[PDB]
Amino acid sequence: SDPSSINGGIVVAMTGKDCVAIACDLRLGSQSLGVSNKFEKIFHYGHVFLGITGLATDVTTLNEMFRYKTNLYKLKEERAIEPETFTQLVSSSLYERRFGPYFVGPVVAGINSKSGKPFIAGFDLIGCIDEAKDFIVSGTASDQLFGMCESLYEPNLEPEDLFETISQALLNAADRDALSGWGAVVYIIKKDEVVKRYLKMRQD
């Protein structure tokens, strides 16, 4: 009944030293029934990454919408959109459906190509920006993620250390949520290289 917890899933993003990380589980379900273990929730438009939790139809719809908008942005601006700018575009786009909203919990992650500054941001379903330096969490196990991130996180982690921290935050949070899991992906993002790692986890 609650649209934000029909399909399940989680996203988490973290900042490190000259890097950002964003991660998600791979589950899509119909309440108790597991449907897909390959439903990735992180997308990217150029060097800006967007994770989206919530109702899966809206996740797909919003990805297509932001691909649409970032492609036109690029054609007109003659440059790739930056994380700060994209964050405002997501906020704008969500609030325009104020009284008929997309049931989602988006998370932006990326590095500004000009300043080199790591950036993350989160949103509620109607566009309120959460602009936190450390970490952003979203999904049906957001409580679990807040707990994991608050205790595991420390600032200025190197890329390969940040990978371990965010991976353990996701994994152990997902294992305390019925509607999250069935696989996981972690993106480690640096100014001009991005590595994508699929994690091994329990499949129940």
């Binding site: 399909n7 899509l28 119909s30 029934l33 449907v35 897909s36 439903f39 109702l55 899966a56 139809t57 797909t60 719809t61 008929g100």
Partner: protein, 195 residues
Amino acid sequence: MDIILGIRVQDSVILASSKAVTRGISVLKDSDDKTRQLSPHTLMSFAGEAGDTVQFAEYIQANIQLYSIREDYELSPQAVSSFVRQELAKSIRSRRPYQVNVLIGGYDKKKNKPELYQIDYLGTKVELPYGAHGYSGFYTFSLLDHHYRPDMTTEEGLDLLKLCVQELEKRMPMDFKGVIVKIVDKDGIRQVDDF
């Protein structure tokens, strides 16, 4: 409607759909074909609210046939499935939503690969090796999880499908009056007349 199953094997996609049409107290029909051919190598099965199912299916069929004529070209299964998803995603925030769940089984002639897409009335699309809608998956997925292989023949897929139907006939309370089975491959779409 009730049970719609789908399984993608090595070289084809098989769709199995129940034959019964029940209106409350009585079973009005026991030979109903819950499927529409969208293009020569693309088949869509459906289940959901009465009226909306066939109206939606025939509306999709017409749109794809129109595209086929205008461009003298058959859309890929992926393209057809994305079109259908958008229509359902559009529908869910309408005044009166289409309450229809579909399976799209197609053979991509460019890639020479069978493809199965599962889409629910919300516009939730997933590509799968095997899929279902409603309660059908609750009874059948444990069997498919066990026996399925991506290199199965069409004959092996049909045998695994029989096992799935047998389990449905045993543990499901409702009489769905058997299934019509259709195969989608490189040569097009054909119906298995003995199942």
